[PDB]
Amino acid sequence: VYKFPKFSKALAEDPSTRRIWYGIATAHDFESHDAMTESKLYQKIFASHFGHIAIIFLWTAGNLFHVAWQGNFEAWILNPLKVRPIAHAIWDPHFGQAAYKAFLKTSSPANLALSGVYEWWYTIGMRTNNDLYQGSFFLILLSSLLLFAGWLHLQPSFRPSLDWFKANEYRLNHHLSGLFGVSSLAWTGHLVHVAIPESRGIHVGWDNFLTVLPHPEGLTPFFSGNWKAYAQNPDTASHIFGSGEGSGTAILTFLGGFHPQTKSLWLTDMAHHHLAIAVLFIVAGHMYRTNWLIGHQMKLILEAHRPPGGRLGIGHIGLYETITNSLHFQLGLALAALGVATSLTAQHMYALPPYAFLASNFPTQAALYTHHQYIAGFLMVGAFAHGAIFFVRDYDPAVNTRNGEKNVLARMLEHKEAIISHLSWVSLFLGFHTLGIYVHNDVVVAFGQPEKQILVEPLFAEWIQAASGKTLYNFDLLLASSNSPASVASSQLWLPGWLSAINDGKNSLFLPIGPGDFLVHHAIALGLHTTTLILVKGALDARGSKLMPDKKDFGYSFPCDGPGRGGTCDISAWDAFYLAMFWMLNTIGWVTFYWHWKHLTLWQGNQVQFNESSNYIMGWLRDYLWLNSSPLINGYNPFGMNSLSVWAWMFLFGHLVWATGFMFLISWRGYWQELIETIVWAHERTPLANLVRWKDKPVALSIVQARLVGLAHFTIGYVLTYAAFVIASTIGKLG
Amino acid sequence: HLITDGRWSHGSEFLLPSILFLYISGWIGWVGRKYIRTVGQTSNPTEKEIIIDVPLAISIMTSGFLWPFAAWQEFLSGDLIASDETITTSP
Amino acid sequence: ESTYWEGKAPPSVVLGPFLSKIPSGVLGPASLVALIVGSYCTHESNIFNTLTVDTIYPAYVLGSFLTPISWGLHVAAWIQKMNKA
Amino acid sequence: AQSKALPFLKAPAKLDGSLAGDFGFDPMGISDQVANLKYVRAAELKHCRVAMLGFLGWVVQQYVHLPGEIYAESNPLKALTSVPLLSQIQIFLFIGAIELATLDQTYTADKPWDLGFDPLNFSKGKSEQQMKDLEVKELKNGRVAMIAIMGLIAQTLYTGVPLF
Amino acid sequence: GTPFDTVSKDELAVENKAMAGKSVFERAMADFNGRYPAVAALGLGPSAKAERWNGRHAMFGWIVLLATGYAQAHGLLPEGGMDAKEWGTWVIVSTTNGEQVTIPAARAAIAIGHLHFGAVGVFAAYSKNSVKDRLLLEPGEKDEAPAGLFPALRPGLTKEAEMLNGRVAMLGLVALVAVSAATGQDILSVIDQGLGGLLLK
Amino acid sequence: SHTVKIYDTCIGCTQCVRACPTDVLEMVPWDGCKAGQIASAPRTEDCVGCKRCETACPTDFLSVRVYLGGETTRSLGLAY
Amino acid sequence: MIYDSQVYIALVIAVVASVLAIRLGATLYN
Ligand code: CLA
Ligand code: CLA
Ligand code: CLA
Ligand SMILES: CC(/C=C/C=C(C)/C=C/[C@@]12O[C@]1(C)C[C@@H](O)CC2(C)C)=C\C=C\C=C(C)\C=C\C=C(C)\C=C\[C@@]12O[C@]1(C)C[C@@H](O)CC2(C)C
Ligand SMILES: CC(/C=C/C=C(C)/C=C/[C@@]12O[C@]1(C)C[C@@H](O)CC2(C)C)=C\C=C\C=C(C)\C=C\C=C(C)\C=C\[C@@]12O[C@]1(C)C[C@@H](O)CC2(C)C
Ligand SMILES: CC(/C=C/C=C(C)/C=C/[C@@]12O[C@]1(C)C[C@@H](O)CC2(C)C)=C\C=C\C=C(C)\C=C\C=C(C)\C=C\[C@@]12O[C@]1(C)C[C@@H](O)CC2(C)C
Ligand SMILES: CC1=C(/C=C/C(C)=C/C=C/C(C)=C/C=C/C=C(C)/C=C/C=C(C)/C=C/C2=C(C)CCCC2(C)C)C(C)(C)CCC1
Ligand code: SF4
């Protein structure tokens, strides 16, 4: 009953099971630990970062090793459009003979790989199960390096100080230039040297790379300035990927669009992209001042940025010390940027597939988009939660105020009511009218008169599609016109490739849109606005409100303030995160439902099914869920089973976890404490069991813990059931 | 399909119904606000909200046809917006 | 130091210890010349003549970079002029 | 000014006096980040010793070989692959056995480079000036060897000629 | 970089004079015990108790390897594979083309024998109050003192004799595995070569 | 044990003391209000955190404030 | 198909990465 929460003496003195539960959930909140200083905080965070990167590299190495050992990578190379990639083998003693037979792939039961790693590794120039093994070996070596570094930087003479950790200019210069630019430069080097010849049949391994010229002229044009030579003779339109037939000699080109065979971006396009990004980031990494008297001091930049007329208060004067001294502000900024970035990855890796033969891998396309959108929602909610935490525990009004006037951040708490009221107005506006139009379509179609539907053509979005060259909406605007200056300017660089790809019905590049797209985009906007409303309200109201003008004194996460003053359930800022998680899950569900139904109709060919039935709710319920759930639920029946049996089991498992979350959310404490007391009496008053007694007094889960557990069940069930549905439906419908 | 980009050619699909709704909803909001402000200066403002003063309610409701003009005659006089008597939370 | 300002124009220290000492009568015309040169270089690399692999012309490219710069030069020129420089 | 190697720069604060071989050569100011010069000197001396041994092995393998056939490769970089993995893993295990105890030793001691290796007692009876002179000799020779062994590796990777 | 100190003066390494002399074995033992208590106090890790137990197991396993070689040579060690219909799909190793290669029956029998011995060990582990030599160290008990480079030359059924023989057997197993890995033959093939041919005859 | 603080906005109306279910609060002499009394929290080890004390507080934003902290068998209300 | 030697040495290297992980884990304290 002691010594487990070593970091908290208050918990270690708890005589109940709450100590164990809270010991888990407070282990990473280093700022709240006993005998805590800032130096130890930054050093522990640094070591934890090292361990985390080691974990990531070990996970990647495991994926590589299992593809190399139990996969069919080599067979998939020779026939990427017919051979289904294998993730890893299965050894489960609970299998019957039927399950073994159904999951049997080649030599052993195995799982199909939906991560798209086969296409990614094939694109970057891997052709052998020994290339994957080398990658796994190297990644385990890197993990060992990172673990050694993490141990080393906790040693006495190697523990960095607060000044080093808060040295913003040095870290920015190095991160930008070194990390981004130099990693892009090295990736361009690999892309060219290995990937470009490997796509043309020439093997460039760790033996013949110092003697195989990536370009026939060989670094002469680069120093000579004849950089056009690297773009001459690109890959033809009859080039077979991985073979020298119809190949070229160029390494950096503009082509635009996709490879005619793999239906993916040109490797020479991506090498040029990464070279340009490398140059730009290396240049941008010299901005801030270091030991050589030139550069920028960001404190001065922030302080000097006050509009002269005066509408942002005193400007950004106090922001430098605010961000530097708070790890939650930086964490929130990083999480918001990462969420936007992974939303970008999801939205671009389906419209512009970058890996060979990934466009025809429909289950992996759906899985990748869903995975990245869910990660995006999680990251955004985390960014807002950490902003709220910064408000609660790191924000100092004195730093952000100069002689009564407030800086740009402190002024966000002055018109907080205006911000929240207008977020509420936008949410109500969008919800009222999107639901009104959807229900109008529902009722009108149900009454057998679909012509009375309200169908709004998304002209604004179709205008953008025409601006990028789509000649489908008869707009003749910028790139849909051959005479506009936008078209004449790039008529010789990348329009022929771009136009040939955007004006193609088999791509996902700028999918044609209609009224259903309009309505679902408005639903998405409503979801985004409502999630933002909850999170922003929790962040701004974190330090106090009218119901609790001292909420900052109770911390970020506390159960309530009691039944007084009318009742104060879910009044903390943590509860705002807890409520906004449901809205994030709902919004990501809407986004992924829209994406998956649109792409299922596109792949099956019945795009008229979406364009007609997507305007009313029953259309969704009947033609997406009810229609495509048939292959999934018949993964095992009283007659047999298929390789989709695991997905049906996961479907039911997700439903069960969802409803257990419903348990933990609807039923609150107090009802579970008295029942536990009855159980305690029963155990204490029964023979043959009195010999065994608990060391920690069994008590009901706390209010905040119960909310967390219900949210965890809700989210896990949500994710599992939707993953099972999307994967099984795609597999069982599209062969 | 409804063309709601703003062009007057298809103006009867969205723009004219938009104007009609804006008029009606502004009427409703104006009469509600006028009734709230009128019975807010009586002895028992809360009583007159569950038990409506039907004479005064009828008087105000039929006066909402000038809500666009009344709104841009009360905003000019500064009687439409409060300034600093509005309450604010602790931070 | 103290780049923070509340008057009509920021102090000349915000321009760095290279632009803080340029007379406004030098920065102004220099900014206008740089803007004109950059606009012409952009309109000669593109717009007037369509771009091609064989026609990149580092002068026009480097030139075009004077347009973004021009913005900074005339901002500094105004700052110097308002600070009696 | 205070740098002997770069007579024009002033050396950094941590480059002074003791720690023989101190010629004020730290233009990039790397010593400003390390808490002390103990670990960096240990690493430099380990590199110096490994590079001396590497240069000696390079030349000897150029001219002298073991009686067996597996050691008949003249090119050291080609011998890196021709030699059986058993010999190389034995060498690596020996080095790691030497390295783990010194791993415990280096991160905490005042003289991490002092491994207590003096079987012939070349330092017993030597005065402080003579000991410092020996340390300077070792550091010089090691730096020259490091440059030389890197040059040999580069010229073998670029021309295939392992020597001259 | 220059205007500040990367490492604070208050956080600096101090040389541990408590390990002066203290040959690498004593230093390693002390470092392990200080760094990992509550597993060192149990006798686990680089400890004399663990060394003695592992030596006993290595000697018994040299006996077991000899017995396995004899059984393989003398027509024992049943033939074929396990019945998947009888023992489920967990005994299936691979399916090449329409035939299920299962775990060899000989491997199953050897695993059952090893299970017998391991069960005996587990019983002795959860029988601490009735066994002569316990598996772990009692709280308070102190680990027998390391024997050193060369244990005392005391012939017979002595602690030093068992210690020396356990070290020899463990080194023999290490050498056997190293020879098998380096050369590439089976473990039993290496034992057969190292016995002249008198085992697999 | 939870933390209970009393603030000088206390009007000495005793409603907090007579609402405490575990006898944590008591009325002590004072000279900052008309009643000449102020609430005190000398037995916070018995505080259970039910916050009945501040449900009976008539002052604007409370004069008795309960800050939940470390848990104890007394503060958890455990009869077992 | 990878050999037994390839998998075995990868397992051995994985063990070394495990001992480095517990050293980091124990250094981040109990
Ligand atoms: C060149 C030198 C260099 C390099 C390579 C690094 C590299 C790193 N440092 Mg680091 N650091 C440096 C110098 C350097 N540092 C210096 C000088 C200091 C002292 C001032 C620090 C202080 C420091 C601290 C205190 C910490 C790090 C950490 C890290 C790691 C970050 C985690 C990671 O793996 O990210 C990998 C990231 C990438 C490979 C790139 C990310 C790609 C992004 C997401 C895509 C963005 C593209 C685009 C913009 C998207 C938007 C679209 C656009 C249209 C807008 C990383 C390994 C952290 C860590 O984990 O420590 C172990 C940490 O806590 N460093
Ligand atoms: C790199 C990103 C990052 C980082 C560094 C942190 C770091 C931190 N967060 Mg944070 N957070 C993040 C992302 C991040 N978070 C995101 C994305 C969200 C939104 C979901 C949040 C939401 C959040 C909240 C709401 C809170 C924190 C808190 C904290 C602090 C303490 C964490 C703690 O106690 O962990 C405790 C760890 C756990 C309780 C483990 C939970 C594990 C979950 C339930 C998943 C495990 C189930 C698993 C999937 C099983 C699968 C089931 C199977 C059947 C399939 C710490 C500073 C807390 C704090 O006090 O901050 C000051 C706090 O209240 N964060
Ligand atoms: C009739 C008077 C009236 C007026 C002038 C307003 C005006 C406003 N409300 Mg509002 N509101 C009202 C009644 C009114 N409300 C009532 C009765 C409710 C309870 C359901 C709300 C609930 C409400 C919410 C939840 C929100 C607003 C918001 C707003 C603002 C933006 C407009 C909007 O979103 O409409 C909202 C309108 C509704 C949700 C529907 C109102 C219900 C009916 C139509 C109004 C009642 C008519 C009344 C009985 C007429 C009697 C008068 C007669 C006796 C003479 C704006 C200041 C939003 C805001 O703060 O943005 C700045 C916001 O988030 N209001
Ligand atoms: C080996 C060496 C010193 C070895 C000393 C040892 C082991 C001493 C060990 C001991 O003292 C201790 C530690 C402790 C004592 O109690 C015991 C002993 C055992 C006695 C120095 C080498 C020092 C080696 C040096 C300085 C080498 C310099 C090399 C140069 C300049 C080469 C240049 C070229 O190779 C290139 C670059 C390119 C080629 O093509 C052309 C040429 C010209 C050939
Ligand atoms: C070689 C070895 C350890 C070598 C350790 C070394 C060099 C350590 C060196 C260091 O510490 C120093 C000096 C100083 C430190 O600062 C640094 C390092 C470098 C760390 C252990 C072998 C250890 C070998 C062991 C433990 C062998 C155990 C064998 C057993 C138990 C037998 C089992 C069987 O009987 C069964 C169970 C069933 C039968 O069928 C099969 C068999 C296998 C026969
Ligand atoms: C001790 C041993 C076996 C002991 C067995 C015992 C006690 C059995 C006891 C029994 O009760 C049981 C358990 C069960 C009963 O039913 C049977 C009996 C019999 C009653 C095997 C050692 C086996 C020991 C072996 C195989 C040793 C191999 C050593 C090698 C190869 C050494 C090589 C080197 O020496 C060189 C060549 C050069 C050096 O410089 C380097 C190195 C590498 C050190
Ligand atoms: C709470 C809080 C927080 C947080 C916050 C957040 C989380 C936010 C988010 C945010 C976000 C998330 C934002 C976003 C943004 C975005 C943007 C801003 C965008 C932009 C874009 C653009 C501008 C584009 C443009 C264009 C177009 C459109 C076309 C193409 C081309 C171009 C480019 C021109 C913090 C921590 C900080 C602090 C405290 C408070
Ligand atoms: S919680 Fe409020 S009421 Fe319950 S005891 Fe402590 S003070 Fe008295």
PDB file of N, CA and C in Angstrom, chain A residues 82-116:
ATOM      1  N   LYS A  82      -1.998  -8.312 -58.292  1.00  0.00           N
ATOM      2  CA  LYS A  82      -2.743  -9.530 -58.001  1.00  0.00           C
ATOM      3  C   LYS A  82      -2.366 -10.153 -56.668  1.00  0.00           C
ATOM      4  N   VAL A  83      -1.100 -10.078 -56.280  1.00  0.00           N
ATOM      5  CA  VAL A  83      -0.647 -10.648 -55.017  1.00  0.00           C
ATOM      6  C   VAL A  83      -1.027  -9.707 -53.884  1.00  0.00           C
ATOM      7  N   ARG A  84      -1.641 -10.257 -52.839  1.00  0.00           N
ATOM      8  CA  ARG A  84      -2.030  -9.465 -51.682  1.00  0.00           C
ATOM      9  C   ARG A  84      -0.909  -9.473 -50.654  1.00  0.00           C
ATOM     10  N   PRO A  85      -0.413  -8.313 -50.225  1.00  0.00           N
ATOM     11  CA  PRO A  85       0.688  -8.291 -49.254  1.00  0.00           C
ATOM     12  C   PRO A  85       0.303  -8.947 -47.937  1.00  0.00           C
ATOM     13  N   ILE A  86       1.287  -9.590 -47.314  1.00  0.00           N
ATOM     14  CA  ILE A  86       1.110 -10.295 -46.049  1.00  0.00           C
ATOM     15  C   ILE A  86       1.852  -9.529 -44.964  1.00  0.00           C
ATOM     16  N   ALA A  87       1.164  -9.256 -43.853  1.00  0.00           N
ATOM     17  CA  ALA A  87       1.781  -8.522 -42.753  1.00  0.00           C
ATOM     18  C   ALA A  87       2.682  -9.426 -41.919  1.00  0.00           C
ATOM     19  N   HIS A  88       2.108 -10.466 -41.320  1.00  0.00           N
ATOM     20  CA  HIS A  88       2.868 -11.399 -40.502  1.00  0.00           C
ATOM     21  C   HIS A  88       2.075 -12.691 -40.376  1.00  0.00           C
ATOM     22  N   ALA A  89       2.766 -13.750 -39.965  1.00  0.00           N
ATOM     23  CA  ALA A  89       2.126 -15.043 -39.801  1.00  0.00           C
ATOM     24  C   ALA A  89       1.318 -15.082 -38.506  1.00  0.00           C
ATOM     25  N   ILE A  90       0.451 -16.085 -38.405  1.00  0.00           N
ATOM     26  CA  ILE A  90      -0.430 -16.266 -37.258  1.00  0.00           C
ATOM     27  C   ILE A  90      -0.126 -17.612 -36.620  1.00  0.00           C
ATOM     28  N   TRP A  91       0.031 -17.618 -35.299  1.00  0.00           N
ATOM     29  CA  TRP A  91       0.086 -18.852 -34.517  1.00  0.00           C
ATOM     30  C   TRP A  91      -0.816 -18.647 -33.305  1.00  0.00           C
ATOM     31  N   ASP A  92      -2.042 -19.157 -33.392  1.00  0.00           N
ATOM     32  CA  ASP A  92      -3.024 -19.028 -32.321  1.00  0.00           C
ATOM     33  C   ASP A  92      -3.540 -20.421 -31.991  1.00  0.00           C
ATOM     34  N   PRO A  93      -3.324 -20.920 -30.774  1.00  0.00           N
ATOM     35  CA  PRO A  93      -3.765 -22.289 -30.451  1.00  0.00           C
ATOM     36  C   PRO A  93      -5.269 -22.478 -30.484  1.00  0.00           C
ATOM     37  N   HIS A  94      -6.051 -21.402 -30.426  1.00  0.00           N
ATOM     38  CA  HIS A  94      -7.502 -21.516 -30.390  1.00  0.00           C
ATOM     39  C   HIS A  94      -8.116 -21.766 -31.759  1.00  0.00           C
ATOM     40  N   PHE A  95      -7.324 -21.706 -32.827  1.00  0.00           N
ATOM     41  CA  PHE A  95      -7.859 -21.914 -34.165  1.00  0.00           C
ATOM     42  C   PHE A  95      -8.373 -23.337 -34.329  1.00  0.00           C
ATOM     43  N   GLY A  96      -9.517 -23.466 -34.997  1.00  0.00           N
ATOM     44  CA  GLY A  96      -9.942 -24.744 -35.515  1.00  0.00           C
ATOM     45  C   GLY A  96      -9.286 -25.013 -36.852  1.00  0.00           C
ATOM     46  N   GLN A  97      -9.600 -26.178 -37.417  1.00  0.00           N
ATOM     47  CA  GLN A  97      -9.083 -26.495 -38.744  1.00  0.00           C
ATOM     48  C   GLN A  97      -9.641 -25.536 -39.789  1.00  0.00           C
ATOM     49  N   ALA A  98     -10.911 -25.149 -39.642  1.00  0.00           N
ATOM     50  CA  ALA A  98     -11.523 -24.226 -40.593  1.00  0.00           C
ATOM     51  C   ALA A  98     -10.847 -22.861 -40.557  1.00  0.00           C
ATOM     52  N   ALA A  99     -10.549 -22.353 -39.360  1.00  0.00           N
ATOM     53  CA  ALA A  99      -9.878 -21.061 -39.256  1.00  0.00           C
ATOM     54  C   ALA A  99      -8.472 -21.120 -39.837  1.00  0.00           C
ATOM     55  N   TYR A 100      -7.748 -22.210 -39.575  1.00  0.00           N
ATOM     56  CA  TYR A 100      -6.426 -22.386 -40.165  1.00  0.00           C
ATOM     57  C   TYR A 100      -6.510 -22.386 -41.684  1.00  0.00           C
ATOM     58  N   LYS A 101      -7.480 -23.115 -42.236  1.00  0.00           N
ATOM     59  CA  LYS A 101      -7.619 -23.190 -43.687  1.00  0.00           C
ATOM     60  C   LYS A 101      -7.978 -21.835 -44.283  1.00  0.00           C
ATOM     61  N   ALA A 102      -8.871 -21.091 -43.628  1.00  0.00           N
ATOM     62  CA  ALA A 102      -9.308 -19.812 -44.177  1.00  0.00           C
ATOM     63  C   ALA A 102      -8.207 -18.764 -44.104  1.00  0.00           C
ATOM     64  N   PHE A 103      -7.473 -18.717 -42.995  1.00  0.00           N
ATOM     65  CA  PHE A 103      -6.389 -17.753 -42.871  1.00  0.00           C
ATOM     66  C   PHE A 103      -5.106 -18.219 -43.541  1.00  0.00           C
ATOM     67  N   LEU A 104      -5.074 -19.444 -44.060  1.00  0.00           N
ATOM     68  CA  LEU A 104      -3.860 -19.979 -44.661  1.00  0.00           C
ATOM     69  C   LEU A 104      -3.478 -19.184 -45.899  1.00  0.00           C
ATOM     70  N   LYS A 105      -2.250 -18.671 -45.906  1.00  0.00           N
ATOM     71  CA  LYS A 105      -1.694 -17.949 -47.044  1.00  0.00           C
ATOM     72  C   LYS A 105      -0.288 -18.482 -47.277  1.00  0.00           C
ATOM     73  N   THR A 106      -0.085 -19.122 -48.429  1.00  0.00           N
ATOM     74  CA  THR A 106       1.163 -19.794 -48.779  1.00  0.00           C
ATOM     75  C   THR A 106       1.464 -20.934 -47.809  1.00  0.00           C
ATOM     76  N   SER A 107       2.330 -20.689 -46.824  1.00  0.00           N
ATOM     77  CA  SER A 107       2.828 -21.752 -45.961  1.00  0.00           C
ATOM     78  C   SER A 107       2.224 -21.766 -44.564  1.00  0.00           C
ATOM     79  N   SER A 108       1.652 -20.658 -44.104  1.00  0.00           N
ATOM     80  CA  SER A 108       1.141 -20.563 -42.746  1.00  0.00           C
ATOM     81  C   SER A 108       0.006 -19.555 -42.732  1.00  0.00           C
ATOM     82  N   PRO A 109      -0.921 -19.654 -41.781  1.00  0.00           N
ATOM     83  CA  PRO A 109      -1.927 -18.598 -41.633  1.00  0.00           C
ATOM     84  C   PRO A 109      -1.256 -17.254 -41.399  1.00  0.00           C
ATOM     85  N   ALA A 110      -1.778 -16.226 -42.060  1.00  0.00           N
ATOM     86  CA  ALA A 110      -1.137 -14.923 -42.034  1.00  0.00           C
ATOM     87  C   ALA A 110      -2.184 -13.839 -42.216  1.00  0.00           C
ATOM     88  N   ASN A 111      -1.798 -12.619 -41.866  1.00  0.00           N
ATOM     89  CA  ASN A 111      -2.668 -11.457 -41.970  1.00  0.00           C
ATOM     90  C   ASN A 111      -2.246 -10.613 -43.164  1.00  0.00           C
ATOM     91  N   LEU A 112      -3.220 -10.209 -43.976  1.00  0.00           N
ATOM     92  CA  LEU A 112      -2.940  -9.264 -45.047  1.00  0.00           C
ATOM     93  C   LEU A 112      -2.473  -7.941 -44.456  1.00  0.00           C
ATOM     94  N   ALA A 113      -1.545  -7.283 -45.142  1.00  0.00           N
ATOM     95  CA  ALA A 113      -0.979  -6.029 -44.661  1.00  0.00           C
ATOM     96  C   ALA A 113      -1.782  -4.861 -45.219  1.00  0.00           C
ATOM     97  N   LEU A 114      -2.414  -4.100 -44.329  1.00  0.00           N
ATOM     98  CA  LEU A 114      -3.198  -2.934 -44.706  1.00  0.00           C
ATOM     99  C   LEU A 114      -2.470  -1.627 -44.433  1.00  0.00           C
ATOM    100  N   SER A 115      -1.209  -1.693 -44.012  1.00  0.00           N
ATOM    101  CA  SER A 115      -0.439  -0.493 -43.720  1.00  0.00           C
ATOM    102  C   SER A 115       0.197   0.118 -44.959  1.00  0.00           C
ATOM    103  N   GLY A 116       0.136  -0.560 -46.102  1.00  0.00           N
ATOM    104  CA  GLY A 116       0.753  -0.031 -47.301  1.00  0.00           C
ATOM    105  C   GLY A 116       2.260   0.029 -47.257  1.00  0.00           C
TER     106      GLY A 116
END
